[PDB]
């Protein structure tokens, strides 16, 4: 008796609804096996980790819990609009769209301070920097620059992942001016990561020739790392 | 015509809205209220309260009342509120992993198919919504099976009571038969019943 | 004495304290020193605060909280208790909250052992151990006296 | 005598820096080391001796030391409510065989 | 000051428990999508927006 109005009439209101401004995401795909929602984690290099769809028991709002007993009043005792022979009505695509809109301005503005401040905190787009004076003469911002691994992680690293270009190279005792060149020839960002004894030989010189800030774990003995075979480097 | 409004950044908002849901418990409700309001708006399902259950005569019969009873308690009262909301969640975002208002049954009295039926009727009626909770339920059903199918829910639970999808779809069937707390709805496990595999 | 370095007239003592702290070893501290915070519902559980209290009263405080925390038992398993306690096959649902309601446990080994002795002295004890059941039984209402 | 006397003469003589014999608190009545994983607060290390000599192993009192206290989110002794369902039937309720 | 009365913002609510409030620091976020094992995937073009 019910499918007459139910499949034919409830179905449409549902489809029209599948397109509502806000009801975003994805709910299914008709397949019970296999379909698993897509997960979203707000991850941050600075150690933030708050996933979007987390499971946390019944909330105060009152939605979390699903209750199947609702099937009966719908199935047995609930009169319909097009079942007993009223004239199907139609929502005014206005109230409910202006409304979806109503929430969006209200909603985006609200995350406005919360999002605004963290940025003040992030200290957006800018790596610290210690420039080490090489070749006694030439002074200030005329040597080798290198920044702490944490700075590199945070600000400069996430960007690298997006461009695709293969992650940086490793300042190693062996690597010649060629390896550094080839790596920057790829990532094309001019940053080299250090994690191998002395830098020694040229290349370190090539570094004077090129920004190629070299990133390295915490500062100290950062002159005992390089092989300033002519005293200029100096942890100070 | 070219209205003089600003714009409607599809990206800023898909993501801007993203931060809000991620860290703002209340958004699920704000949204499910539009559809819920909208559905009540389309006058899609008016609700009556002149209670109509069983073929009436059943309520009156001596023997049936045992069943007149299970269904009577299982079934509730048409809340004007619950029915739209019930429909609204069919299509609206999911932000908490719905839990199944655990229905504790024993399945040991033929009149009790009433409950297995609640689900079939329910899954059919709002399946996308039902999908979230296939686990709490797969959870209820094997019990029904342990009851009405000993021989078959012998090999079935054993084949594995939960499975996963291998890099090549081949379902990897776990050999255990642990329960299924929603706690792993977001993991890589699927309740096993619904594997729909022979 | 430390919360008063370069902060007290008395020059000597101050000089040494300001110096005493200079040692490679000793290093004073104060307030919120380390936090671990439940998984699942990402809020912050037990905070380790370096408040200055003796060293003894303090260490023992950890004896209780530490044990409380060690016993991975929560307030959820509790339903298991009244679980056995009620018309064998009753049903207890939810709500269950992870490690946001840790509960000591239930020292099983102490009681029968402590309890054995309890009854050994006051033998009148059986009067109660039975008192309760009688109350429970008349309560489940399984037999009502009458003049029929 | 005087064993509880850990600090003596808090005044400053004018001539001679250290007044005639004055104690001045030992580097313990303020060493607030860490808090072992096991829960035994132990004095700050000593150039990598790692283990800080558990505060309770030696015999020096030590005002100040980490205390792990539980926050506002871990109320305990909470009277928690549950829904109990009395199995319907009775005649059904099985007792025997496991 | 903005006039957008904020409540239960950033917090939680779940009846039964308290309304324990998460943190809010966040620095820079990436709405990266997490492999099932609950651990951040390296943003891929042909799978996520």
């Amino acid at each position: 008796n019910i499918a007459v109005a139910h499949t034919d009439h409830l179905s449409v209101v549902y489809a029209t609804m599948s397109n509502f401004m806000l009801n975003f995401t994805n709910n299914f795909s008709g397949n019970h096996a296999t379909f698993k929602p897509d997960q979203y984690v707000i991850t941050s290099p600075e150690g933030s980790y708050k996933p979007i769809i987390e499971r946390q028991g019944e909330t105060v709002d009152g939605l979390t819990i699903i209750d199947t007993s609702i099937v009966w009043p719908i199935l047995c005792q609930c009169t319909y609009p097009l079942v007993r022979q009223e004239e199907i009505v139609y929502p005014d695509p206005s109230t409910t769209l202006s409304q979806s809109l109503s929430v969006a301005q209200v909603l985006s503005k609200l995350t406005l301070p919360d999002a605004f401040i963290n940025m003040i905190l992030s200290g957006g787009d800018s790596v610290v920097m210690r420039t080490y004076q090489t070749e006694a003469d030439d002074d200030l911002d005329e040597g080798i620059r290198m920044t702490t691994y944490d700075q590199y992680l945070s600000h400069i690293r996430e960007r690298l992942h997006i461009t695709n270009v293969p992650d940086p190279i490793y300042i190693t005792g062996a690597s010649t001016p060629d390896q550094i060149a080839a790596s920057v020839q790829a990532t094309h960002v001019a940053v080299v990561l250090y994690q191998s004894g002395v830098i020694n030989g040229p290349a370190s010189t090539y570094l004077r020739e090129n920004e190629v800030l070299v990133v390295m774990p915490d500062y100290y003995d950062v002159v005992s790392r390089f092989a300033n075979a002519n005293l200029q480097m100096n942890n100070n | 015509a070219l209205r003089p409004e600003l714009a409607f950044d599809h990206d800023h908002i898909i993501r801007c809205l993203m931060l809000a849901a991620a860290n703002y418990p209340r958004l699920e409700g704000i949204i499910v209220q539009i559809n819920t309001g909208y559905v009540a708006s389309a006058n899609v399902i008016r609700p009556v309260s002149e209670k109509r259950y069983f073929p009436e005569n059943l309520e009156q019969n001596q023997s049936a009342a045992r069943l007149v009873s299970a269904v009577k308690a299982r079934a509730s009262e048409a809340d004007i509120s619950s029915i739209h909301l019930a429909i609204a969640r069919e299509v609206s975002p999911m932000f908490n992993v719905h839990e199944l208002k655990k229905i504790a049954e024993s399945f040991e009295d033929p009149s009790s198919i009433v409950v297995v039926l609640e689900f079939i009727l329910f899954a059919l009626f709002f399946p996308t919504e039902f999908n979230r909770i296939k686990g709490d339920i797969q959870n209820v059903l094997l019990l029904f099976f342990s009851r009405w199918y000993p021989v078959e829910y012998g090999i079935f639970v054993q084949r594995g009571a939960t499975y996963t999808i291998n890099a090549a779809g081949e379902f990897e069937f776990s050999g255990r038969n642990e329960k299924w707390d929603q706690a792993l709805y977001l993991s890589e496990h699927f309740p096993a019943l619904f594997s729909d595999v022979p | 004495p430390a919360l008063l370095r370069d902060f007290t007239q008395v020059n000597w003592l101050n000089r040494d304290i300001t110096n005493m702290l200079q040692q490679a070893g000793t290093k004073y501290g104060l307030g919120l020193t380390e936090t671990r915070l439940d998984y699942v519902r990402l809020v912050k559980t037990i905070v380790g605060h370096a408040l200055n209290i003796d060293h003894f009263a303090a260490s023992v405080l950890n004896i209780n909280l530490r044990a409380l925390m060690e016993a991975n038992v929560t307030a959820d398993d509790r339903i298991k208790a009244l679980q056995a306690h009620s018309m064998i096959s009753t049903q207890f649902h939810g709500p269950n909250q992870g490690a946001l309601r840790p509960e000591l446990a239930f020292d099983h080994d102490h009681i029968i052992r402590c309890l054995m002795l309890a009854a050994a002295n006051y033998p009148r004890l059986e009067g109660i151990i039975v008192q309760i059941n009688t109350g429970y039984v008349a309560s489940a209402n399984v037999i009502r006296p009458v003049s029929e | 005598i005087s064993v509880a006397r850990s600090m003596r003469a808090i005044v400053n003589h004018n001539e001679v820096d250290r007044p005639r014999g004055a104690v001045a608190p030992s580097s313990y009545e303020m060493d607030t080391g860490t808090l072992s994983r096991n829960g035994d607060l132990l004095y700050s290390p000593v150039a990598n001796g790692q283990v800080g000599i558990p505060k309770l192993e030696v015999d020096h009192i030590s005002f100040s030391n980490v205390v792990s206290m539980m926050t506002a989110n871990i109320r305990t002794g909470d009277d928690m409510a549950v829904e109990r369902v009395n199995p319907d039937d009775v005649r059904a309720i099985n007792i025997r065989n496991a | 000051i903005t006039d957008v009365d904020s409540t239960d913002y950033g917090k939680l609510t779940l009846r039964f428990l308290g309304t324990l409030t998460r943190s809010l620091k966040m620095q820079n976020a990436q709405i990266r999508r997490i492999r099932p094992d609950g651990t951040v995937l390296r943003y891929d073009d042909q799978i996520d927006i």
């Binding site: 979390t64 | 509730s76 009262e77 | 509790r78 009244l82 709500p95 | 305990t76 409510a81 109990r84 | -």
Partner: peptide, 15 residues
């Protein structure tokens, strides 16, 4: 009997 969400909660358990 009635449509309600969440635990029907009817007992209080003593620590």
């Amino acid at each position: 009997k009635v449509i309600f969400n969440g635990l029907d909660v009817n007992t209080e358990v003593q620590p």
